[PDB]
Amino acid sequence: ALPASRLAFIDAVIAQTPAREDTLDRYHQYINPMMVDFLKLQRCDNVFRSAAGTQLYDDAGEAFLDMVAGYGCLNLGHNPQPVVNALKNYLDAQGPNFIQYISIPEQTAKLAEVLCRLAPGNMGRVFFSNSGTEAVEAAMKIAKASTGKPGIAYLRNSYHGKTLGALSITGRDKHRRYFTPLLDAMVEVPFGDLAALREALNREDVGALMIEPIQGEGGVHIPPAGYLQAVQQLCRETGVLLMVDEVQTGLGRTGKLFACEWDGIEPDVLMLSKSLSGGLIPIGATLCRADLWQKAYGTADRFLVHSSTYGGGNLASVVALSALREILAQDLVGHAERMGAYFKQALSEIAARYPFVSEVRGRGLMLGIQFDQAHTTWKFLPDPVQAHLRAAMDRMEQALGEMFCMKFVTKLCQDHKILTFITANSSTVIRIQPPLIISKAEIDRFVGAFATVCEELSTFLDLE
Amino acid sequence: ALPASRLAFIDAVIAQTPAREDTLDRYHQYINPMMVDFLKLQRCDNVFRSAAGTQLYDDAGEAFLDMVAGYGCLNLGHNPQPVVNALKNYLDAQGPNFIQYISIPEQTAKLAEVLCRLAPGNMGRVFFSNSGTEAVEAAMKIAKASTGKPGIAYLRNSYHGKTLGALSITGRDKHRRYFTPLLDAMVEVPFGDLAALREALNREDVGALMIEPIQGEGGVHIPPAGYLQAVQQLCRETGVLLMVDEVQTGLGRTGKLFACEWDGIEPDVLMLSKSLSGGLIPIGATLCRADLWQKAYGTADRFLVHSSTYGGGNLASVVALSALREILAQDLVGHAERMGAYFKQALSEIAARYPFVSEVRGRGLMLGIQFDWHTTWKFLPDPVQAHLRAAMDRMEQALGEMFCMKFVTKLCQDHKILTFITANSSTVIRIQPPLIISKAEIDRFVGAFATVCEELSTFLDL
Numbered sequence: 001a002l003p004a005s006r007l008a009f010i011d012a013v014i015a016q017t018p019a020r021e022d023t024l025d026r027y028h029q030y031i032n033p034m035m036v037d038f039l040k041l042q043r044c045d046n047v048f049r050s051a052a053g054t055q056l057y058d059d060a061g062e063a064f065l066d067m068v069a070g071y072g073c074l075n076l077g078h079n080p081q082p083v084v085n086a087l088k089n090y091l092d093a094q095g096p097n098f099i100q101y102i103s104i105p106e107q108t109a110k111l112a113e114v115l116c117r118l119a120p121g122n123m124g125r126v127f128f129s130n131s132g133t134e135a136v137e138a139a140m141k142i143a144k145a146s147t148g149k150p151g152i153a154y155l156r157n158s159y160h161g162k163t164l165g166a167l168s169i170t171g172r173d174k175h176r177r178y179f180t181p182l183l184d185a186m187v188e189v190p191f192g193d194l195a196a197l198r199e200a201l202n203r204e205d206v207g208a209l210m211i212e213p214i215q216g217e218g219g220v221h222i223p224p225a226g227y228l229q230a231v232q233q234l235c236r237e238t239g240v241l242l243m244v245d246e247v248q249t250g251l252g253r254t255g256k257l258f259a260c261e262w263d264g265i266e267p268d269v270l271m272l273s274k275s276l277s278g279g280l281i282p283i284g285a286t287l288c289r290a291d292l293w294q295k296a297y298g299t300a301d302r303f304l305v306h307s308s309t310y311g312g313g314n315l316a317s318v319v320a321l322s323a324l325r326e327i328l329a330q331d332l333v334g335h336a337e338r339m340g341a342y343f344k345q346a347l348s349e350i351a352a353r354y355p356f357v358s359e360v361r362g363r364g365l366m367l368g369i370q371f372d373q374a375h376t377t378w379k380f381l382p383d384p385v386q387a388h389l390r391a392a393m394d395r396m397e398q399a400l401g402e403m404f405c406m407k408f409v410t411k412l413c414q415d416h417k418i419l420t421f422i423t424a425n426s427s428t429v430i431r432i433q434p435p436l437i438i439s440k441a442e443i444d445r446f447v448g449a450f451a452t453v454c455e456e457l458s459t460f461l462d463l464e
Numbered sequence: 465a466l467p468a469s470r471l472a473f474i475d476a477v478i479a480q481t482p483a484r485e486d487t488l489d490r491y492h493q494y495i496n497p498m499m500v501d502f503l504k505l506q507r508c509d510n511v512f513r514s515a516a517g518t519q520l521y522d523d524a525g526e527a528f529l530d531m532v533a534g535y536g537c538l539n540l541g542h543n544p545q546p547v548v549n550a551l552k553n554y555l556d557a558q559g560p561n562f563i564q565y566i567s568i569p570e571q572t573a574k575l576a577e578v579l580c581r582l583a584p585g586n587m588g589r590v591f592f593s594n595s596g597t598e599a600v601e602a603a604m605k606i607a608k609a610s611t612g613k614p615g616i617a618y619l620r621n622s623y624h625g626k627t628l629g630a631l632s633i634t635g636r637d638k639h640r641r642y643f644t645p646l647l648d649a650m651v652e653v654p655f656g657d658l659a660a661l662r663e664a665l666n667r668e669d670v671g672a673l674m675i676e677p678i679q680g681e682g683g684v685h686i687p688p689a690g691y692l693q694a695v696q697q698l699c700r701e702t703g704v705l706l707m708v709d710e711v712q713t714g715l716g717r718t719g720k721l722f723a724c725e726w727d728g729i730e731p732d733v734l735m736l737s738k739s740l741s742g743g744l745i746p747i748g749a750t751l752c753r754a755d756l757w758q759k760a761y762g763t764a765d766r767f768l769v770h771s772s773t774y775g776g777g778n779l780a781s782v783v784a785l786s787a788l789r790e791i792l793a794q795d796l797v798g799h800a801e802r803m804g805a806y807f808k809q810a811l812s813e814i815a816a817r818y819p820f821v822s823e824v825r826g827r828g829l830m831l832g833i834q835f836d837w838h839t840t841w842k843f844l845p846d847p848v849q850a851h852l853r854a855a856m857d858r859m860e861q862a863l864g865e866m867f868c869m870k871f872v873t874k875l876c877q878d879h880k881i882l883t884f885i886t887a888n889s890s891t892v893i894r895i896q897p898p899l900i901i902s903k904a905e906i907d908r909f910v911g912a913f914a915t916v917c918e919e920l921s922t923f924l925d926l
């Protein structure tokens with residue numbers, strides 16, 4: 001009946017392989033009770049015990065096919081062995097890690113050289129951070145410090161991260177709603193609208209523009225035919241920096257090492273994260289022209305102005321170096337294109353048999369599927385009560401659209417053990433974002449399950 | 465040429481085993497040439513080949529003693545083997561990593577329960593992020609959304625990170641000046657000042673206050689005798705959240721598992737990072753009261769509003785758990801205290817022997833050391849006089865920057881010891897070693913510091 005010591009408590013926690021229920025209890029208590037209740041509600045409250053390649057294994061050992069791939073940080077799949085080996089070996093060699101501001105980091109130097117030479121444009125500099133949002137802040141500050149102007153234009157339905165800097169150029173109200181006011185001088189331009197973008201970019205206080213090659217968390221929209229290039233030229237016209245967020249489209253995901261390659265876009269600043277981790281170690285990178293970095297920070301007061309405690313550690317860089325390598329050795333760029341074209345075709349063929357399935361969009365292995373579905377006593381209710389009931393019912397109607405889409409998510413997980421999800425900005429687009437190592441066998445299996453699910457929901461909408 | 469394929473290029477870089485001179489070049493070119501040039505200057509432009517414990521080693525095997533410790537993320541030293549083992553083992557077991565938003569992560573779950581058990585106050589939730597600045601940023605967001613008020617008070621000379629949100633509450637101008645304007649409704653309040661504080665805390669605009677238990681980049685100042693406990697009760701008085709950044713002071717650095725302990729502070733929101741990585745894997749943590757989280761996020765629309773791709777991955781959590789375990793298992797908090805007291809004393813003995821060394825401050829192993837033709841001019845245009853005066857002065861300050869820095873160079877070049885100067889202040893040398901430091905290592909450094917102290921007195925005659 002006497003209490004354990006701290007250490008014994010901790011020892012007993014670390015060492016235990018806990019029951020799934022106890023893990024579910026623990027999250028619920030100490031992390032996010034709504035998240036738990038939600039997955040339980042969607043009947044996808046999984047506890048994964050192991051992972052390899054395209055598979056996640058639960059606590060009973062059952063396998064799941066992972067089309068989320070950690071929202072895009074798993075291009076190489078779960079636990080890729082060469083990346084794993086690279087990491088292990090570095091540690092065995094007692095390589096130094098977090099020493100990048102007290103000495104010159106050997107491995108980070110390697111990655112910087114590599115990234116710049118592979119990057120599009122004329123990148124000469126890199127700052128290393130630990131995440132997407134952080135890599136975005138880094139670009140933001142470069143824009144600010146080199147131009148001296150505090151403004152940045154962004155496009156509606158952009159997603160650039162959730163730190164408040166990044167949030168200020170994130171074109172989606174559901175994410176920004178609660179944190180007003182954000183930063184002044186950022187400008188939302190409607191998407192694909194170029195005359196409007198001339199207006200925004202002429203503005204005295206605007207130094208830069210931030211775009212994504214394809215908007216991801218904004219429902220997988222490839223820009224129109226001439227847009228990105230026009231944007232590029234317009235930015236040259238106006239003296240504005242072109243800043244390209246490739247945290248999501250980068251590293252072979254759209255069928256090119258960089259999505260920029262599709263339209264010959266030459267950024268002034270570029271942002272990488274997600275899969276640069278090798279799905280192992282958090283990492284971000286921000287590349288820019290050497291001469292911009294010069295205007296930003298090439299002064300004795302300025303050269304350490306932006307810095308990061310973890311950012312640029314040798315370890316992460318060892319990992320990334322190895323991740324990149326594997327993307328290249330395994331022809332995953334080519335696979336993404338090829339398998340990507342195949343998947344899209346195949347899905348489209350199912351989607352043009354179902355009116356609720358509207359469209360299949362994307363490039364390489366970045367895809368989304370869009371759905372599209374759906375007296376006196378009253379006279380003498382107060383107007384307030386009537387207005388309130390009207391509005392609820394309105395908003396409910398729309399939510400009924402996303403509930404339909406989540407119905408897909410749930411059936412795939414529950415009936416077919418396939419993990420998919422929905423994008424953060426739109427809740428009406430299923431993301432389809434497999435690891436790039438994905439097989440034809442696996443693709444075809446996804447195609448059939450999805451046909452099964454359309455075939456079932458069509459019949460549920462038929463008993464009405 | 466022609467040019468090499470992308471693969472063979474990468475493979476060549478990977479395979480190469482570069483000379484120290486090539487790394488520098490490479491870094492000069494692609495990362496930060498000012499930094500590289502700086503280090504040549506200080507004569508501390510090392511490229512380290514391995515590291516273990518308190519030791520860093522170069523191309524040739526030469527040992528340096530590490531008084532910087534990654535700026536506080538290495539309480540356990542370089543490559544602590546239990547932590548390295550846990551990592552390797554989780555990888556060998558094929559543990560899933562970044563699955564925290566598509567499923568329920570088991571290891572992360574554990575870490576959150578532990579941290580809540582160990583945290584002071586009554587912490588009931590945790591959000592995992594990837595760095596210090598990101599955890600603050602998550603503190604700021606909890607504050608904004610639980611209260612609905614956009615403003616946060618902060619203390620002058622505070623340091624909370626370099627992302628834009630955090631920087632809006634970092635009270636140091638050398639860090640903000642280029643990136644104005646920052647976020648609105650954030651009030652800087654002077655440090656030590658209760659009335660300035662109460663004043664600010666009463667604004668209708670302000671929902672929270674943020675503080676460090678010892679200001680890190682502001683010269684290692686233990687706050688005055690009753691201040692923190694008063695702030696806590698001021699925050700209660702006013703219904704303003706108390707938010708404590710223990711990024712630097714947490715995990716044994718000051719001789720208590722959390723520095724809050726020294727003054728029985730009970731935060732509403734607490735931040736953690738740096739040493740939580742065990743020096744391996746970037747990680748951040750933000751803890752709050754559960755009723756706070758409910759207010760901020762406990763709804764259908766709000767429960768996923770704050771999130772992170774990497775944040776809350778199993779791997780980092782495994783590492784963090786292991787490193788916690790080690791701090792506890794090796795009595796490292798007591799060691800910091802005990803070793804800390806001794807180090808402080810020992811440095812005190814020396815500095816009373818010199819007057820350019822004014823003060824030695826800190827608790828445990830968070831320490832700092834403080835330091836201390838007629839007509840021609842006449843007929844110069846006024847602007848000219850005003851520019852040469854302003855410069856001449858600004859140098860005045862700078863001459864004392866260079867004095868400290870000289871001490872750093874000397875420690876490095878002649879004794880192979882690494883130290884630095886705080887990020888906000890330049891006239892304070894940090895002494896912030898891994899908590900595994902030994903009495904002997906401490907003696908070696910005290911001795912070195914004495915040697916240098918003299919050779920800058922002797923040289924401070926002419």
Ligand SMILES: *Cc1c(COP(=O)(O)O)cnc(C)c1O
Pocket residue numbers: 131132133134136159160161162212216217245246247248273274771772773774
């Ligand atoms: C995911 C994402 C980010 C932010 O990444 P985090 O790592 O979550 O910070 C930024 N930009 C884009 C385009 C993204 O997809």
Ligand SMILES: *Cc1c(COP(=O)(O)O)cnc(C)c1O
Pocket residue numbers: 307308309310595596597598600623624625626676680709710711712737738
């Ligand atoms: C270093 C530091 C931060 C920022 O940490 P990063 O991980 O470098 O972002 C925040 N708060 C305090 C008190 C710190 O010392």
Ligand SMILES: [Mg+2]
Pocket residue numbers: 351352353354355356357358359
């Ligand atoms: Mg259709």
Ligand SMILES: [Mg+2]
Pocket residue numbers: 815816817818819820821822823
């Ligand atoms: Mg003295």
